Amino acid sequence: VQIVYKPVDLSKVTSKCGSLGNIHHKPGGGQVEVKSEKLDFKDRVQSKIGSLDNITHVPGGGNKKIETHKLTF
Amino acid sequence: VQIVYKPVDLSKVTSKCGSLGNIHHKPGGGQVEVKSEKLDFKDRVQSKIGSLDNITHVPGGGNKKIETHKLTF
Amino acid sequence: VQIVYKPVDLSKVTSKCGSLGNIHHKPGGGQVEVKSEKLDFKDRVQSKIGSLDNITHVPGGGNKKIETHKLTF
Numbered sequence A, B, C: 001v002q003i004v005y006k007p008v009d010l011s012k013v014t015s016k017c018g019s020l021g022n023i024h025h026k027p028g029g030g031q032v033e034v035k036s037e038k039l040d041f042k043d044r045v046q047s048k049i050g051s052l053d054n055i056t057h058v059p060g061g062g063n064k065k066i067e068t069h070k071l072t073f
Helices: none
Strands: A002-005 A020-025 A032-037 A048-050 A055-057 A066-072 B002-005 B020-025 B032-037 B048-050 B055-057 B066-072 C002-005 C020-025 C032-037 C048-050 C055-057 C066-072
Touching: A002 A066, A032 A048, A048 B032, B002 B066, B032 B048, B048 C032, C002 C066, C032 C048
Parallel strands: A002 B002, A020 B020, A032 B032, A048 B048, A055 B055, A066 B066, B002 C002, B020 C020, B032 C032, B048 C048, B055 C055, B066 C066
Antiparallel strands: none
């Protein structure tokens, strides 16, 4: 088996976002309330309560060229 | 086997973001009240309460070229 | 097995973010309250309470070329 493997990219990925802003994200709602009585757990518990893990993500340009060359035998 | 693996890129990933700002992220809500009585656990507990793990990510440009070349036998 | 492995990049990853700022992140809500009575644990507990692990991340440019080359037999 002979392989010549000679890809070429002039590949161009761009943004000209003129202005970006006035972005508001507010997961802070009203009362969370949890009340619990006489409840039994025989195995593991992973309780998450409140306003967890929320994201704001504002890349001024967010271009993402993913690229993969793979050979296998 | 013979391989001549010779890829080329002139590959260009860019952002001309003119002005980025006025971004607000507020997971700070109202109360988070937890009350608990006579409550039994036989195995591991991983309680998380409140306003945890939240993110604000604002890269002035966030361009992310990812490029994998892989050969395997 | 013969391999010639000679990739080329003139590859360019850029930002011209003109201005960046006025970013606010506020996980500090109202009262978290936890009250507990007659509560029993036979194995490990990993309680987290309040406003932990929060992130603000504002790189003036945050471009991230990742690039992997791998050969294996």
